[PDB]
Design a protein around this nucleic acid. Structure first.
Lengths: 99, 108, 543, 359, 113, 125, 51, 125
RNA sequence: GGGGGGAUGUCCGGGUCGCCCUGGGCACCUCUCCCGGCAGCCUUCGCGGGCAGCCGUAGUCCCGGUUCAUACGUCGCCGC
């Protein structure tokens, strides 16, 4: 995915999918949006997927859950991303009283 | 007190880099230089510099003299034509003007 | 539209000719029998055979000797061979760059390629290895003949342009060698719109032959040079590269951002495509060991050097001239000193399989900088010539200020301000003075704390403003800057000014027929070398 | 220029010993380019040479040699002084260049100047409009900034100039980095004055209204952070902090659901704008796929105009052919559609009337 | 089967030696059959593929004149209607399909169609 | 409260809008609302948005469900984009402090929690 | 100079500040486990081997 | 679980630390913990922090209360700053996506909520 | 996109009451030049300059509704 973003073709890789295949790519993006080692590539393929397959979310319902279940982790990823910078200032506190 | 050396190196121009007779030397025409390489070892055996001077003038074309080898017809943008000989440098100081508005190509 | 063409004679009488016109749409037309079709009011119908493989304009097409093979070469970096008796092709796919010119020897055995990255190779046929190789300086060139594929209104029309100064160092402990940044080809470098130079080549200064080549960023000479849409792919550019004091260590930075036509789908509110690219900037900082075969080896690669809520760009880096330590200043506001140590996790050192211990560079010191914002900043740094003290110019518009920091300890020894009229361009440090250049140039001593030399430069375009730069000798106390005489185009004139440290009279002024791209200082002796866009190199010296 | 300026400086020393400050003011007027009439723009000040600047600073300010000197006003009432403050030359680097001789053995020079200068300006002018001019003009350090905030707080805790200067100092100290700000704030303040300052910043927050109900920022968060952990535990070691963190939590809840609806309203706005273009085009009769009903279409998508340019191989661009445009339009058309032709169409003037089945 | 039609001409010089002048994708599916004709001032070749549409190509002036895709729909209209009952009707292999329309269009001058 | 909201919107009331909105029924209202009234509604909430930024907990929910139900009404009602973008920068003023206020919460929360630790020690001491 | 074809090099991702070191993989690479009970569950007093 | 945590910390256990930590009592543990053990504790949690970033909901609370209670222990125990800064950049890797993931939540939430609107219409249809 | 007009349909005070208009709301067609792009022809080595310009939107006789992709050299097994 990083090579396919370095070459300008990630849209080309995603734009011709089918229903079960796009469910699979949503499933992988949902599973691995949590890790901060590749949250960037994961949110990039998530952006392109929402842009490229948002019209048949009513035509099929099993895809509709996977878009919603992508939210549920995103709604839970922001909280851990929120608390991490709460501690991020909390650890900044002791590193200034040490001097 | 300071001094500036002569230009060396250069850009390899888009004219076809020509072969010699008997396949042993390759004569490559840069801009403001034309130099001949020994092929088996990849080493320049001669570098015939060419003075250019009129802002954007370039070596337009170059070829061997098809009558007699070891002679190069070289032609620049403004109409100057050199009849130099590789394995020496006889002819750099003596170009010949052709009295032209602008030269676009040549063929011997 | 005719790009190139080669004719071949059907023979001491001339019975016929057979021409191959390589047309810039990517086609190769073969006209079979022209003289027998045009000797005879009326003419019989002619119909050129179409061979279409390339995508961009073919740069050269030639028949090979006995006329069985129609060989060709274009921008896709591949020497194709049309079999022309059967219907097959067979090809040498992975050169360095675009196939600019080809020829065949009088005997049919040797091919000869002029490669776009300043090179030439004599190949033996069916050996297909370069029996002879010659490479030059490979800088950015403003070519007189503009381009063979700029004729048909492509998506990005390739322009004869210079954007940025050449990233080039003269290496100590072998001053005749010069490390400098080159892309894959000249055309492939300037194509796409942005400079894309992920290669370092080493070039010999005594005898101007390009010694060797190596890759810094990621680079795929085995992949397709173009995307499916038609845009040339852009690689990470090596922005800053400075050399150690030992001659054995090397620090590089590469920057890369996706295209603004690529993003198209991350824009939510007031976010433009340029904003999306500048947010998805990727930047690596890489520490390399230099082996005496001029071999570059990685030891360290930091992904987030100057990091805040998003990634921040790195402005400059410089080596301490006494110890092995690289300072970097960036868009965050802090200045970071990196030093090498040995990998030792728990007393268990990890070694090379030969036995030598692995070293790794890491952040030695962190120095936050003071900021004074009155009512898009830049950076620059330079060590002293004696070490222990580092000058750091921080560069908001007109208000911009220098800070001199001790290196033994993270305390600030000095801060001066009011010394810049515009945005900073760069800064060096002589024996006691700082030579800074912004829209104005100032030589300023710090031992007396006084502006020795001041200069207002003539107002010029933004390209020339980015194109000026200076370099200092450090052996004979003399600096020299480089400026083109006033958007950039082909025929321009430039002049450089070698000053001395003490006076205001430039000891040498020389205008040049082409605009100069790089100025560097040989460390072993006095003087400088200079690289000019009509890519020629020459040396200036005292005596 | 060195010898000419040295003679001019010698003339100024002669006039200093002769003690004619009027003609000295006029020579400095002709230098800086008595009446001494002002321009009404802080930026619109002419360029002047650094040697004249530092000589003027040496003339107006003073030093006390006892291992720690003290700037003093040899000329406390001077248009030269108010010009220096207005043009912003009163920096630590400038005063170091003015006092290169007497200082080189003194330590902590930046700290000493940044703690001494605003006290001097505050005793020069009790009305501190000169001080707000200082805060608005000069490049300031964090020491100078926290010192000026101290002077404003002692002044307050005809009634808007001080608050103007206080807000300018707040923005400037937010721009100033964390380390030096914390160090000089802990140095120059006391924890009770810090608590008063936190009450000022709480007043800024609650007056901006981050808690007081709806239907009935950067700089403040940064400054509260730097002050709180400049004091630290050795100062505080209550319900004060309980109610304070209650209000902070209310603010953060506001801003988080704010970024939520910011994203939502941004995507709906951009869809309504593309819809404006598409509705104008469907009214003209370009016959694209338009939504009609009052609920949103699921994918927030429209059909833009088909471009007049195509992409050929390998990378060139050509103008689209009307034939292919019609091919794509027949593609874009749906299953069932009512396409009424009129007599104006048969004459050749107007267009048709189209309603397609909403796919 | 690469939906691809190529045109071959003799090479000049040696006898009986052929080479590919030019190729192009005329059809949309695989080109299954073709037959040529040359008479009464008309030189054509017609190629039927799997897209039901026969394409004719000029032979002696190939590359000098455009080809032509004949209509794959039958020449007889094969659609009829009883306008009084508003019935439209069509037919193929063994079935006859009848649609009713139930309304005019002046009423519709989106969700009801 | 459908006709109530509908009256207040098309009559440019204030206090009737307060009476119906200052408090399920929220979704029922926005289901029974009409279209250009929802456009004026979003306009009025943008006014309340900038004027007093204290309790977001009701009005962001109201704007949310409005964009849900009659969002596509504004799509075919598309000359009034300014009513959306006059809010859309208003909420980008509302995000400012989240760049740094979160770091203040961390540095301040320990001062709370250290009191909490000496207060959880206090009953046992 | 036909540059040889190269497959896609994998990513050297950053590791956290507790990598499983070489000795850790060694002492976990002492792989195959056999549990031989003693007679009457006597506690094993000593084990030894010559040099 | 004070002596339990204390054993696992000074013996460099793994599974005993799991047994006591993978689940009030959290505050009681950190009250009864000892000092250099808390330093090694923060080190071990930093390891867990980078290794699997799934459930923050327990371990951030643990690190929180540790910095509360024995934070000032680390202050007079100050040669081990690397144990704090090895986490302190680990958490600045943990903030990356909050620059843009929040904008993905908004663009995606309407696709949820539009389904929610057609699903709240569905019982009545 | 702007500035302006010529002409299309409309309600609110309306007007002897009609051609319409002024004040408000307006959506379309036409002209006008500046904006962004393309091309041609002359002058210059180029940098640039000059000239009459087209495109910024829609559906065809047929039909560009095309043409276009990156090799060999050697395979397999096991170990560090």
């Amino acid at each position: 995915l990083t090579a396919l973003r370095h070459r300008s073709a990630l849209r080309e890789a995603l734009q011709g999918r089918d229903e079960l295949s796009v469910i699979n790519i949503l499933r992988w993006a949902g599973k691995y949006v949590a890790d901060p080692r590749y949250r960037s590539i994961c949110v990039d393929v998530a952006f392109h997927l929402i842009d490229l397959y948002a019209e048949h979310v009513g035509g099929s319902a099993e895809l509709a859950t996977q878009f919603q279940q992508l939210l549920a982790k995103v709604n839970r990823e922001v909280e851990k991303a929120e608390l991490a910078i709460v501690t991020g200032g909390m650890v900044e506190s002791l590193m200034m009283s040490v001097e | 007190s300071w001094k500036v050396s002569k230009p060396m190196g250069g850009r390899m121009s888009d004219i076809d880099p020509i072969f010699s007779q008997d396949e042993r030397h390759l004569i490559i025409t840069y801009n403001t230089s034309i130099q001949v390489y020994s092929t088996e070892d990849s080493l320049l055996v001669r570098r015939i510099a060419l003075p250019l001077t009129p802002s954007a003038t370039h070596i337009v074309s170059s070829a061997l003299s098809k009558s007699n080898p070891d002679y190069l017809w070289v032609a620049c943008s403004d109409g100057r034509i050199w009849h130099i000989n590789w394995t020496s440098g006889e002819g750099v100081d003596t170009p010949s003007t052709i009295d032209t508005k602008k030269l676009l190509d040549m063929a011997v | 539209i005719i790009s190139t063409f080669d004719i071949r004679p059907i023979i001491a009488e001339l019975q016929d000719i057979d021409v191959a016109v390589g047309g810039a749409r990517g086609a190769i037309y073969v006209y079979s029998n022209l003289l027998a079709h045009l000797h005879t009011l009326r003419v019989g119908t002619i119909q050129p055979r179409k061979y279409h493989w390339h995508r961009r304009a073919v740069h050269s097409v030639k028949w090979s000797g006995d006329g069985n093979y129609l060989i060709s070469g274009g921008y896709e970096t591949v020497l194709v061979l049309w079999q022309l008796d059967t219907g097959r092709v067979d090809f040498l796919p992975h050169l360095s760059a675009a196939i600019e010119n080809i020829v065949v020897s009088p005997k049919g055995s040797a091919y000869a390629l002029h490669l776009d990255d300043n090179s030439a190779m004599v190949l033996s046929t069916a050996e297909m290895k370069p029996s002879m190789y010659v490479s030059g300086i490979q800088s950015l060139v403003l070519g007189d003949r503009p381009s063979k594929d700029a004729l048909v209104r492509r998506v990005w029309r390739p322009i004869d342009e210079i954007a940025s100064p050449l990233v080039a160092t003269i290496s100590p402990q072998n001053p005749s060698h010069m490390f400098l940044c080159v892309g894959n080809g000249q055309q492939a470098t300037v194509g796409g719109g942005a400079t894309s130079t992920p290669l370092v080549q080493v070039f010999d200064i005594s005898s101007f032959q390009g010694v060797a080549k190596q890759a810094i960023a990621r680079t795929n000479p085995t992949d397709v040079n173009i995307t499916s849409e038609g845009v040339p792919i852009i690689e990470p550019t090596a922005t800053k590269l400075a050399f150690s004091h030992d001659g054995k260590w090397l620090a590089s930075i590469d920057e890369w951002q996706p295209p603004e036509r690529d993003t198209e789908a991350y824009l939510t509110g007031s976010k433009t495509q340029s904003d999306a690219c500048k947010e998805r900037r990727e930047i690596y900082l890489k520490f390399w060991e230099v082996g005496a075969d001029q071999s570059l080896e990685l030891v360290t690669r930091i992904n987030d050097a100057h990091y805040t809520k998003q990634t921040e760009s790195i402005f400059d880096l410089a080596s301490d001239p006494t110890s092995a330590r690289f300072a970097t200043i960036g868009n965050d506001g802090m200045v970071r000193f990196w030093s090498p140590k040995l990998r030792k996790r728990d007393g268990l050192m990890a070694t090379r399989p030969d036995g030598q211990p692995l070293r790794s560079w890491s952040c030695s010191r962190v120095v936050p900088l003071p900021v004074h914002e009155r009512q898009p900043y830049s950076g620059a740094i330079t060590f002293s010539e004696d070490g222990s003290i580092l000058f750091a110019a921080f560069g908001p518009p007109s208000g911009a200020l220098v800070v001199a920091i001790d290196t033994q300890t993270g305390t600030v020894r000095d801060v001066v301000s009011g010394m810049f009229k515009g945005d900073i361009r760069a800064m060096k440090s002589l024996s006691s003075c700082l030579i800074m250049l912004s829209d104005d140039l100032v030589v300023y001593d710090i031992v007396s704390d006084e502006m020795l030399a001041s200069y207002t430069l003539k107002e010029t375009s933004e390209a020339a403003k980015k194109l000026t730069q200076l370099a200092v000798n450090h052996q004979s106390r003399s600096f020299a800057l480089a400026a083109p005489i006033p958007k950039l185009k082909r025929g321009t004139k430039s002049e450089l000014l070698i000053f001395n440290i003490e006076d205001e009279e430039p000891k040498l002024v020389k205008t040049f027929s082409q605009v100069i791209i790089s100025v560097c200082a040989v460390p072993s002796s006095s003087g400088f070398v200079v690289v000019d866009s009509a890519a020629q190199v020459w040396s200036i010296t005292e005596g | 220029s060195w010898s000419e300026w040295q003679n001019k400086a010698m003339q100024a020393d002669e006039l200093l010993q002769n003690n004619d400050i009027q003609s000295w003011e006029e020579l400095m007027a002709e230098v800086f380019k008595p009446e001494w009439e002002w321009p009404s723009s802080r930026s619109d000040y002419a360029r002047v040479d650094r040697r004249w600047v530092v000589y003027a600073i040496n003339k107006v300010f003073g030093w006390e040699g006892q291992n720690t000197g003290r700037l003093t006003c040899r000329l406390p009432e001077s248009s030269v002084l108010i010009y220096l403050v207005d043009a912003g030359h009163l920096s630590t680097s400038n005063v170091k260049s003015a006092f290169k001789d007497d200082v080189r053995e003194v330590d902590k020079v930046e700290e000493l100047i940044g703690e001494q200068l605003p006290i001097i300006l505050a005793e020069v002018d009790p009305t501190m409009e000169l001080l707000v001019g200082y805060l608005s003009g000069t490049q300031l350090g964090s020491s100078e900034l926290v010192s000026s905030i101290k002077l404003l707080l002692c002044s307050l805790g005809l009634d808007e100039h001080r608050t103007r200067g206080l807000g300018i100092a707040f923005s400037k100290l937010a721009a100033c980095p964390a380390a030096e700000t914390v160090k000089s704030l802990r140095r120059l303040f006391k924890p009770d004055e810090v608590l008063v300052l936190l009450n000022v910043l709480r007043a800024e927050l609650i007056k901006d209204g981050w808690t007081t109900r709806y239907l009935d920022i950067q700089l403040i968060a940064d400054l509260m952070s730097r002050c709180i952990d400049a004091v630290g535990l050795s100062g505080w070691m209550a319900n004060f902090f309980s109610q304070f963190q209650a209000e902070i939590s209310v603010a953060l809840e506001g801003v988080m659901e704010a970024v939520r609806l910011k994203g939502v309203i941004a995507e709906a706005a951009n869809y309504a704008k593309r819809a404006r273009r598409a509705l104008a085009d469907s009214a003209k009769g370009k016959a694209m796929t338009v939504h009609m009903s009052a609920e949103l279409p699921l994918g927030l998508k429209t059909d833009n105009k088909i471009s007049t340019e195509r992409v050929r191989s390998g990378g060139e661009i050509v103008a689209r052919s009307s034939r292919q445009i019609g091919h794509f339009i027949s593609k874009r058309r749906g299953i069932y559609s009512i396409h009424r032709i009129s007599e104006e169409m048969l004459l050749g003037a107007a267009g048709p009337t189209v309603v397609q089945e909403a796919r | 089967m690469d939906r691809r039609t190529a045109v071959y001409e003799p090479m000049a010089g040696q006898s009986g030696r052929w080479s590919k002048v030019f190729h192009r994708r005329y059809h949309q599916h695989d080109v299954k059959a073709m037959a040529s004709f040359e008479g009464k001032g008309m030189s054509v070749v017609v190629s039927g593929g799997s897209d039901a549409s026969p394409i004719v190509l000029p032979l002696r002036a190939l590359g000098k004149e455009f080809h032509r895709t004949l209509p794959h729909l039958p020449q007889h209209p094969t659609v009829l209607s009883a306008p009084k009952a508003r019935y439209i009707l069509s037919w193929w292999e063994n079935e006859i399909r009848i649609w009713h329309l139930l309304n005019s269009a002046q009423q519709f001058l989106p969700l009801n169609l | 409260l459908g006709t109530v909201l509908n009256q207040a919107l098309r009559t440019d009331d204030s206090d009737l809008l307060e009476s119906c909105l200052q408090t399920l029924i929220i979704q029922n209202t926005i289901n029974r609302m009409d279209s250009s009234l929802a456009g004026t509604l979003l306009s009025k909430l943008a006014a309340r948005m900038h004027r007093r930024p204290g309790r977001a907990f009701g009005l962001m929910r109201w704007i949310q469900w409005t964009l849900v139900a009659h969002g596509g009404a504004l799509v075919t009602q598309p000359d009034l984009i300014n009513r959306l973008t006059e809010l859309s920068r208003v909420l980008e003023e509302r995000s400012r402090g989240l760049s740094s206020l979160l770091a203040l919460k961390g540095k301040l929360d320990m001062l709370d929690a250290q009191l909490k630790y000496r207060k959880a020690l206090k009953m046992a001491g | 100079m036909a540059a040889e074809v190269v497959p896609l090099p994998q990513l050297k991702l950053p590791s956290g500040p507790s990598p499983i070191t070489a000795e850790q993989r060694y002492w976990r690479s002492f792989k195959k486990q056999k549990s031989h009970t003693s007679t009457a569950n006597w506690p094993i007093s000593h084990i030894s081997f010559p040099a």
